Amino acid sequence: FEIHNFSWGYIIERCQKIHQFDIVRELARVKCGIMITGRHMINIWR
Amino acid sequence: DYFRIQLNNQDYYMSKPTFLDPSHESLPLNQFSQVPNIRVFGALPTGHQVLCHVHGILPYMFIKYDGQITTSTLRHQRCAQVHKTLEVKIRASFKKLGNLNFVADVSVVKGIPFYGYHVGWNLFYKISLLNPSCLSRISELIRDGKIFGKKFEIYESHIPYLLQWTADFNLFGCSWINVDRCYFRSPVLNSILDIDKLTINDDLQLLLDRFCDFKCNVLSRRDFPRVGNGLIEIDILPQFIKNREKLQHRDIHHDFLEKLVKPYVSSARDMINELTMQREELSLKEYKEPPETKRHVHQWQSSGEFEAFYKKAQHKTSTGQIPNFENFIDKNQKFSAINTPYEALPQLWPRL
Amino acid sequence: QLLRKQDYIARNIEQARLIGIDFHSVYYRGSQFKVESFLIRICKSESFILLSPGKKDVRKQKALECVPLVMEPESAFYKSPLIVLDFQSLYPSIMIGYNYCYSTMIGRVREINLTENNLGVSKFSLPRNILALLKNDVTIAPNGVVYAKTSVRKSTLSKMLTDILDVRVMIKKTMNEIGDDNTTLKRLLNNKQLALKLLANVTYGYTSASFSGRMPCSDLADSIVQTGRETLEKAIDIIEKDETWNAKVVYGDTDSLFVYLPGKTAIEAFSIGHAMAERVTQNNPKPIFLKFEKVYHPSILISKKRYV
């Protein structure tokens, strides 16, 4: 629900700002607004 | 009896040309530096997510022909010249002409325009590109007249690469991809955390034993490493895709054949067949639709003026002879050697 | 639970299966992608060649000069029954009956040159003896564009539209003939019907591409709107040309017709509207069909598109 300023976006911003860890490149199905490679994103409120 | 994969997600990337990718009709002496590969994230009917690497599928665009319809020799020279000029212009804009990186080959195919009433064969080119992301921009140059001296109309350029791929080969979204052969990658039982034993079952084992030989079907782990964080990943060739060959190609537009059928393209015909099967499931007897008899008139306010203008145009657009529905189209330019669009895509495939 | 109640995922999957695009593009893209994916298959099946103009060419094309018809309603409190006639899929029916498309358009009735001809955002040149040969199999449009008849060439847009319509009526009949079936088949047929409705509504939006277009033709949309206006006014004249049905058209916005029957025993108003619809459809091409579908015994017509 509202993945921009909530769970998904919150986790992404946290790992990007604090830990400096690209989790978006890990959650994808490949080794090499949110665009995850292989998996889709649905905004429930939209 | 066919290997089925669903189309849940599609993506394209660039890689070096391997033995499974084409590297060479316009300029065969010049190799390719980078070829595009399509990634299709699918799921087997058993429920296991699969990653597929599609090769050989290259974008293209058509333009108006320059020469005349009169020996299959000058066509190759013209195509090579056009390819060289396009490569030079692209390398000059984007900053012995070897190892082409933008254009792959240029061919000659016949066609019929769609924006207008044309009942005659027209010759077009086939500019096969390599990087689709810039391909549109390339057409912009062709639309700006920077490559050649005069401006040329662009044909089949607004359609993206993925759409052209899924259309050329009769595939749809969230549908099965019927294929009979494939090529395997690094060990099929991926062991990232537990996937090598937690997801394996009898159905997947049978599917593997039917399509995996482990002697000549698995690729080397040093040349084709696994880059997918899931189940087994396979590599597919355009010669193996069996989704095509089901379309019914028609050529009733090169001459007045209509002047002298209801089931159209699959996903509509497929839906109709599924509904007929549901009816045959003993739900009910039959489907029907009653027609209504109608009596059309349908003139308008400007009907007389339109008729007068049509008569004046027919008087103007006429030169002393009489037109016949059988003698209008000249019986010349057989165009038998020129390849049809749906007969030209099977070309440029590397080898078996 | 919310996404399972609305059946969003299954509906999107069915819509993608009907069109043939990616699952992400169903909600991330617009309406042009679906119609483009349909016409590309439609032309590759018949070996056509599509045109892809630029932004400078679409902006320099002829602007739309034909507008639809809207009747200014007489704001009053109507006590008598107000019969509501409404056409179903007027624009697709217009495209199917009158054979309008890009492959059948010949050119404007006026300024018919031999070398410099202009249609939409492209230039072409007519043949030498094409008009003298096709003078019989043509259907001139009120906007002034010439179109080939259905006997010399069948439109590809007509094919897609009639396929959408016939699978739609097939799904409707299949749903209205079974009542004891479970929710599975009902949900499947409802999803298919919603997908076909979306397709049949989006197929017209690809015409004339007012802004941010890829393949527009202002003449096609102008002719469609003009022949729709002509059909509307002809139906109005047919309704008002009967002395037995002392009615009057008061309101209608490009698809509907509001006729007033002062104190006309509303039980019989159903049969009156049925006869009116039969008389309207028996004077139009085959795919055209008028729908009765409702009555309004009390009515308050505030303004245009403002009533209750």
From Swiss-Prot, chain B:
<protein>
    <recommendedName>
        <fullName>DNA polymerase zeta catalytic subunit</fullName>
    </recommendedName>
</protein>
<comment type="subunit">
    <text>Forms DNA polymerase zeta with REV7.</text>
</comment>
<comment type="function">
    <text>Nonessential DNA polymerase. Required for DNA damage induced mutagenesis. Involved in DNA repair, mitochondrial DNA repair and translesion synthesis. Translesion synthesis in S.cerevisiae may use a specialized DNA polymerase that is not required for other DNA replicative processes. Has a role in the bypass of abasic (AP) sites. Highly inefficient in incorporating nucleotides opposite the AP site, but efficiently extends from nucleotides, particularly an A, inserted opposite the lesion.</text>
</comment>
<comment type="similarity">
    <text>Belongs to the DNA polymerase type-B family.</text>
</comment>
